[PDB]
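Troubleshooting log. The previous run stalled partway through. Resubmitting the same four chains, unchanged.
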Amino acid sequence: QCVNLTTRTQLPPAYTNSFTRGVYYPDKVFRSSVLHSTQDLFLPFFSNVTWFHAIHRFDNPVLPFNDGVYFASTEKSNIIRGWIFGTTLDSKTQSLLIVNNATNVVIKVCEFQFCNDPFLGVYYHKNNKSWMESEFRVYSSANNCTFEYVSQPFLMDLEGKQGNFKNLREFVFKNIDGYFKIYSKHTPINLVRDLPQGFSALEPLVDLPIGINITRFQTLLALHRSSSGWTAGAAAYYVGYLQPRTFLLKYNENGTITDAVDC
Amino acid sequence: NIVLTQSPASLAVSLGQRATISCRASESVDSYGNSFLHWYQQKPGQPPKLLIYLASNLESGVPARFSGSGSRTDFTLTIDPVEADDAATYYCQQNNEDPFTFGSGTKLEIKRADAAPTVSIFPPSSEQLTSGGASVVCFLNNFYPKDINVKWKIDGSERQNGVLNSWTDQDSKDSTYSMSSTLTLTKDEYERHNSYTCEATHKTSTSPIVKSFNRNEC
Amino acid sequence: QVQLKQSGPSLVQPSQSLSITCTVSGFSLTSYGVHWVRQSPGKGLEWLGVMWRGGNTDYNAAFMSRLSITKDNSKSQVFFKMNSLQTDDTAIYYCAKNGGAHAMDFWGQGTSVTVSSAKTTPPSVYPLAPGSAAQTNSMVTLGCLVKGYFPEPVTVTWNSGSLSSGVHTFPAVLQSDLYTLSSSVTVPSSTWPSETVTCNVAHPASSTKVDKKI
Amino acid sequence: VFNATRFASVYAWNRKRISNCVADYSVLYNSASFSTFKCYGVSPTKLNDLCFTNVYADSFVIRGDEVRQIAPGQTGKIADYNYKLPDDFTGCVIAWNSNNLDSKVGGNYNYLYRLFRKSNLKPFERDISTEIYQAGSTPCNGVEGFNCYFPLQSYGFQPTNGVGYQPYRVVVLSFELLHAPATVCGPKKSTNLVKNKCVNFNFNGLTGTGVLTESNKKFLPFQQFGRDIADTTDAVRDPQTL
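Second attempt completed without errors. Output:
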């Protein structure tokens, strides 16, 4: 509603270098043992991506969505809860809200009155835990909805794990004639540093025919505490900007992209 | 007092014709976007009911023949086609200015084929004579038009003093008129003359509708 | 369902006061208005006043200080206080539901308020049977004579309201401080004198019920 | 909406926003359970093969004689003050008799309508305000008095009245198409798949002519079609059967 975090430590805009991340299947066309050349919104390989993290620092700034954005999430505690997409992130116009409340993935498009510092909160992390969410400071109200989607029910394990990052969740977000194509890729990792230098093909997750203009975005994050004196867990995410460059797609016999070349 | 001059006072409209009832008003106009009034219909055995509000809308219960229009002063009701179920008086209630007075009342008459009244008489019972009086009743029914003059005649001469009349208006279903006449006599006067005659003269029936009885019929 | 019949008055004397209680049914009394009128005392139909949808009351120019409306939302009864009633004010009062454009959508049966210096008189029913010499063809006529009652009205029925088709209810004749009403019905010979016929009456002013078999 | 529990008033017609779905429109045209079916600018036989951004099912009830006023560019008390249709209305209006459903003992007086308004409403607009208006400067401010009419008049729906007065549940099917991608389409009637025969095919996205035949290939869960090295369609996945 009006809750703004005061425990946010000020840090400079750190960044890293992506090796070959940000590659996806531009269409649903099967290909076997060929190199498909295509010019679309891909992340340039060996480019820089902004380094954001959430620890006891909390990064959720208003970031740009000019042409397209790539997400790479290294987590061991499942801090990421969704993304906010919109033009100005206010109730003046419609805005795409993607959120995961640990039971269902809600995807809606309304005149959401987003807060300046949105976040989710997990209560009672010490004793009789149950890892349940009760606080949702994403928005105040919503009117004039045009899209609504709710996934099947599930039980998310939001338990804070120690050691290295075990989950590598990568996503791509772009708008093609109003069709918001969302890609996904989940793979295990053993990472104790910044973004890993490797290769991973991102498959399409969903296609949302919404038809709105997105110029800014934010990232939702979960918190833990047993309302500004909250602390974050242990997770990190990255932001890479896509560009319309030519790329090769090395398809194997099974149809998966095993390698790619930034022209 | 809004002077709503509803004219004419009555009309004899036959089946399959058009009725016209005017309503002149002065106070007032420019309510929101129009200056129309309400219409009603009162049967002789039922209170009135709202037919047309703002002179441009129908109401459930009656057919769609009831319509009309009107200028800033004059308003007209149009019943087309008229049938033998419109024996009722129509009014015009002003709604643009207070008081909400009504019209003079235009009574539409079912112009059907003429008919003569029935023939029947009720001699007095012994209980009537016990009370001291003697009331005879003469029952004339199913006649049209309403022009009828019932008069009694004792054996001595014509009696026009204790002649009673009860004018029943044209019923909704029964499109004819009805009237019950009686005579006020006493026990001593009842035993004076032998017979007593109920004479009647109807506009259509050239011959008089007469019905008498004897005092011994009790 | 929608019926606003009146009750309460029995007989009124000149230059007196009396209230009329009107039953409410078919709509909510708290949100709907209630009109009040008379029944053509001489010239055409007149208008007395109106109680709006939970507000104030409006009345005619002449009946501004004489007549008053009082709406009881707890008992669902609308009282109509009358004052300075003269002999020329004899008429039937009606209640009606207030419409959208100040209209009177639905109406009630009302009650006849007779203003006169004369005193009330109960009814006296007598049987009206045809003469022994009356000739017919398997058909007979009957009637019930309500002679010597005051004030109006009086309800006449046949066998507790069994016959409604051929029954004819005539108006009452004005006599010297009295009224004489007549009723009639045409029935076949199989119903009389073969079967018994009982004529009932109801006088709302005196609440008198006189039974009389013809 | 067709089998709703109850319809709203004609001045407070419920705007049922529908988006991101598919449904047949001729299913109601060939239902024979309606009293009125008149579309404006589109035929019901071709409406199944049309996609739109969003649609609205405006639910309300009106009398039989009042159905004539529900039309684009038509005047009336319920057209100008309660629910106006635009001149370029490319949708469809449907209705059916609800005398056996909405009627009550002695008549249903729960339905209401705006007899008049100070000004005419725009197309696809509703007004639930009970503000009254006077002829002159006499302020009423709530209760009536001195010629300030109440705009919301009640409906009389008797169970034994004529056909022109019985209640009719109307549903105005509005259609809208904007720069946003079309989300509301109709059903694309598919046919039986024929294998090992030279037959013309029309799949979800791709069309052409060729011999349809199965194989031992395996596409990915998201891959719907397939092409050879020269960008020519060499294999596809049947949309119905995986």
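Takeaways: The domain at 121-214 of chain B is CATH 2.60.40.10 (Immunoglobulin-like). The first strand of chain B starts at residue 5 and ends at 7.
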